[PDB]
Amino acid sequence: DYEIQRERIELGRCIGEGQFGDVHQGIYMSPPALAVAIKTCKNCTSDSVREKFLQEALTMRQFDHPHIVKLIGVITENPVWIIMELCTLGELRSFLQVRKYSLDLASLILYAYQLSTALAYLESKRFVHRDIAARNVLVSSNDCVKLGDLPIKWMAPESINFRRFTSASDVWMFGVCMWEILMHGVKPFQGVKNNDVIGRIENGERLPMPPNCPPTLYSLMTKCWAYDPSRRPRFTELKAQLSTILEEEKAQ
Ligand SMILES: Nc1ncnc2c1ncn2[C@@H]1O[C@H](COP(=O)(O)OP(=O)(O)O)[C@@H](O)[C@H]1O
């Protein structure tokens, strides 16, 4: 049972804003003092909203991985709250931007590798994420990121054209996420209209090698962007390859 007694939660400052309401950090005192994130819901006084909001908790409950944000529990009476593990440093994109000149390449590669472990886990669970992007990743510490929870510019051609979503289309999106990370949180296809993306991809064009990105790593990104989904690596292979790239970079 994930129902948490409200008296065990101390609501702290706002740390972000989601689909349903502000998100706060806070403290959960249980059998103590545990930093947590508290997701609120402006309109959960209505059951139709409440049901959708709490669906997030039901989804996250299914997963247990060190690189996926964990559900701690919920409070289902107004005001409805979802209590999640706190990823204290917040959204990855802003994190990468503020630390553009301070995060070493080994750390950026580490973040990609950690994400691939989470994604290989999801693929093994036969779960298709559909929205892999740096905006959906949270930063727990300088050495730990976790997956949170149309984005045409992140989407695989088969997803844009035919609404096909599989672990392979996730791999494509992850390729764009890795590019984002190595670009310090710049979004892909800046200045390009969404409707023009597919045209460039079909032309064979791809996001360019980020400055200072190891060629072996950029090569991995391009493999994620094979047009034919069957030719892309599986996540477990990206995990394996990212491990070696990370180790090589740690070696300097
Ligand atoms: N577990 C968390 N730890 C730290 N910050 C979080 C956490 N959950 C959400 N946030 C902050 O709240 C924002 C919105 O939450 P998010 O989960 O993305 O909303 P949604 O309900 O739309 O999925 C995030 O982008 C981040 O800034």
GROMACS .gro file of N, CA, C and O and ligand atoms in nm, residues 15-24 36-39 53 56 69-70 84-91 135-139 148-149, ligand 1:
model
  159
   15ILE      N    1   0.988   2.345  -0.669
   15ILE     CA    2   1.106   2.309  -0.745
   15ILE      C    3   1.078   2.289  -0.892
   15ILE      O    4   1.170   2.258  -0.969
   16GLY      N    5   0.956   2.310  -0.933
   16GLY     CA    6   0.923   2.285  -1.071
   16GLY      C    7   0.776   2.288  -1.094
   16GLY      O    8   0.697   2.300  -1.000
   17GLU      N    9   0.738   2.270  -1.219
   17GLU     CA   10   0.600   2.280  -1.260
   17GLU      C   11   0.564   2.171  -1.362
   17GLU      O   12   0.634   2.153  -1.462
   18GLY      N   13   0.459   2.094  -1.334
   18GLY     CA   14   0.425   1.983  -1.422
   18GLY      C   15   0.292   2.005  -1.489
   18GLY      O   16   0.230   2.108  -1.471
   19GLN      N   17   0.247   1.906  -1.563
   19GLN     CA   18   0.120   1.910  -1.632
   19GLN      C   19   0.005   1.949  -1.537
   19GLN      O   20  -0.081   2.033  -1.571
   20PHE      N   21   0.007   1.892  -1.417
   20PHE     CA   22  -0.104   1.904  -1.324
   20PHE      C   23  -0.089   2.006  -1.212
   20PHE      O   24  -0.187   2.038  -1.143
   21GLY      N   25   0.032   2.057  -1.191
   21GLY     CA   26   0.051   2.151  -1.082
   21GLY      C   27   0.196   2.164  -1.044
   21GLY      O   28   0.285   2.098  -1.101
   22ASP      N   29   0.219   2.250  -0.946
   22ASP     CA   30   0.354   2.274  -0.899
   22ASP      C   31   0.410   2.151  -0.834
   22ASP      O   32   0.337   2.066  -0.783
   23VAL      N   33   0.541   2.140  -0.838
   23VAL     CA   34   0.610   2.031  -0.774
   23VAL      C   35   0.692   2.096  -0.665
   23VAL      O   36   0.755   2.199  -0.690
   24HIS      N   37   0.694   2.036  -0.546
   24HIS     CA   38   0.769   2.090  -0.434
   24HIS      C   39   0.874   1.992  -0.385
   24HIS      O   40   0.862   1.873  -0.415
   36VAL      N   41   1.214   1.439  -0.041
   36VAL     CA   42   1.127   1.387  -0.144
   36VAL      C   43   1.076   1.497  -0.233
   36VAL      O   44   1.093   1.616  -0.203
   37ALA      N   45   1.015   1.460  -0.345
   37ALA     CA   46   0.953   1.559  -0.430
   37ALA      C   47   0.806   1.530  -0.415
   37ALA      O   48   0.765   1.412  -0.406
   38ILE      N   49   0.728   1.638  -0.410
   38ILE     CA   50   0.585   1.629  -0.395
   38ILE      C   51   0.518   1.694  -0.514
   38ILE      O   52   0.524   1.816  -0.535
   39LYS      N   53   0.451   1.611  -0.593
   39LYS     CA   54   0.382   1.658  -0.710
   39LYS      C   55   0.240   1.692  -0.670
   39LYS      O   56   0.173   1.612  -0.608
   53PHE      N   57  -0.403   1.208  -1.310
   53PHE     CA   58  -0.286   1.242  -1.230
   53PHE      C   59  -0.228   1.118  -1.160
   53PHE      O   60  -0.108   1.089  -1.168
   56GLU      N   61  -0.003   0.849  -1.314
   56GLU     CA   62   0.143   0.858  -1.312
   56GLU      C   63   0.203   0.766  -1.204
   56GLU      O   64   0.306   0.698  -1.224
   69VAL      N   65   1.336   0.735  -1.161
   69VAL     CA   66   1.281   0.797  -1.041
   69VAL      C   67   1.179   0.707  -0.976
   69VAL      O   68   1.089   0.654  -1.042
   70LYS      N   69   1.194   0.687  -0.846
   70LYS     CA   70   1.107   0.596  -0.771
   70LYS      C   71   0.983   0.662  -0.712
   70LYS      O   72   0.993   0.774  -0.662
   84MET      N   73   0.746   1.140  -0.463
   84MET     CA   74   0.849   1.071  -0.540
   84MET      C   75   0.985   1.092  -0.477
   84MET      O   76   1.006   1.187  -0.401
   85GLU      N   77   1.082   1.009  -0.514
   85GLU     CA   78   1.217   1.031  -0.465
   85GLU      C   79   1.263   1.164  -0.516
   85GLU      O   80   1.234   1.201  -0.626
   86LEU      N   81   1.335   1.241  -0.436
   86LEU     CA   82   1.375   1.371  -0.487
   86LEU      C   83   1.503   1.356  -0.567
   86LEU      O   84   1.597   1.292  -0.522
   87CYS      N   85   1.505   1.417  -0.684
   87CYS     CA   86   1.629   1.426  -0.764
   87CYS      C   87   1.667   1.571  -0.745
   87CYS      O   88   1.621   1.661  -0.817
   88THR      N   89   1.750   1.593  -0.643
   88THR     CA   90   1.770   1.728  -0.592
   88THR      C   91   1.826   1.832  -0.689
   88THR      O   92   1.790   1.948  -0.684
   89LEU      N   93   1.909   1.793  -0.785
   89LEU     CA   94   1.965   1.891  -0.873
   89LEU      C   95   1.871   1.926  -0.989
   89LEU      O   96   1.905   2.005  -1.073
   90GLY      N   97   1.756   1.859  -0.997
   90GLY     CA   98   1.655   1.903  -1.091
   90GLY      C   99   1.668   1.856  -1.234
   90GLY      O  100   1.729   1.755  -1.262
   91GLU      N  101   1.608   1.933  -1.323
   91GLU     CA  102   1.601   1.900  -1.464
   91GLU      C  103   1.738   1.896  -1.532
   91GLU      O  104   1.817   1.985  -1.516
  135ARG      N  105   1.486   1.680  -2.147
  135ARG     CA  106   1.389   1.746  -2.058
  135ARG      C  107   1.319   1.647  -1.963
  135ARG      O  108   1.261   1.687  -1.860
  136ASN      N  109   1.326   1.519  -1.993
  136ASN     CA  110   1.256   1.418  -1.912
  136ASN      C  111   1.352   1.339  -1.824
  136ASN      O  112   1.323   1.229  -1.781
  137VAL      N  113   1.469   1.398  -1.800
  137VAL     CA  114   1.568   1.331  -1.716
  137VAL      C  115   1.594   1.423  -1.599
  137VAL      O  116   1.603   1.542  -1.618
  138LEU      N  117   1.606   1.365  -1.480
  138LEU     CA  118   1.635   1.443  -1.359
  138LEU      C  119   1.773   1.410  -1.307
  138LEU      O  120   1.829   1.306  -1.338
  139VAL      N  121   1.828   1.502  -1.230
  139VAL     CA  122   1.966   1.485  -1.182
  139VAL      C  123   1.963   1.471  -1.032
  139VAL      O  124   1.920   1.563  -0.963
  148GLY      N  125   1.277   1.053  -1.562
  148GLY     CA  126   1.166   1.109  -1.486
  148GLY      C  127   1.035   1.042  -1.521
  148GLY      O  128   1.032   0.943  -1.594
  149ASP      N  129   0.926   1.100  -1.467
  149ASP     CA  130   0.786   1.054  -1.484
  149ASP      C  131   0.741   0.956  -1.378
  149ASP      O  132   0.735   0.985  -1.259
  253LIG     N1  133   1.135   1.365  -0.849
  253LIG     C1  134   1.165   1.493  -0.870
  253LIG     N2  135   1.280   1.547  -0.816
  253LIG     C2  136   1.318   1.673  -0.849
  253LIG     N3  137   1.242   1.753  -0.933
  253LIG     C3  138   1.129   1.701  -0.985
  253LIG     C4  139   1.088   1.572  -0.955
  253LIG     N4  140   0.970   1.548  -1.020
  253LIG     C5  141   0.939   1.660  -1.088
  253LIG     N5  142   1.036   1.755  -1.068
  253LIG     C6  143   1.040   1.891  -1.123
  253LIG     O1  144   0.909   1.916  -1.166
  253LIG     C7  145   0.902   1.937  -1.305
  253LIG     C8  146   0.771   1.884  -1.359
  253LIG     O2  147   0.752   1.752  -1.313
  253LIG     P1  148   0.719   1.635  -1.416
  253LIG     O3  149   0.725   1.503  -1.353
  253LIG     O4  150   0.806   1.644  -1.540
  253LIG     O5  151   0.569   1.678  -1.444
  253LIG     P2  152   0.462   1.579  -1.512
  253LIG     O6  153   0.354   1.542  -1.415
  253LIG     O7  154   0.409   1.667  -1.625
  253LIG     O8  155   0.533   1.450  -1.561
  253LIG     C9  156   1.026   1.865  -1.354
  253LIG     O9  157   1.059   1.911  -1.481
  253LIG    C10  158   1.126   1.900  -1.246
  253LIG    O10  159   1.165   2.035  -1.256
   0.00000   0.00000   0.00000
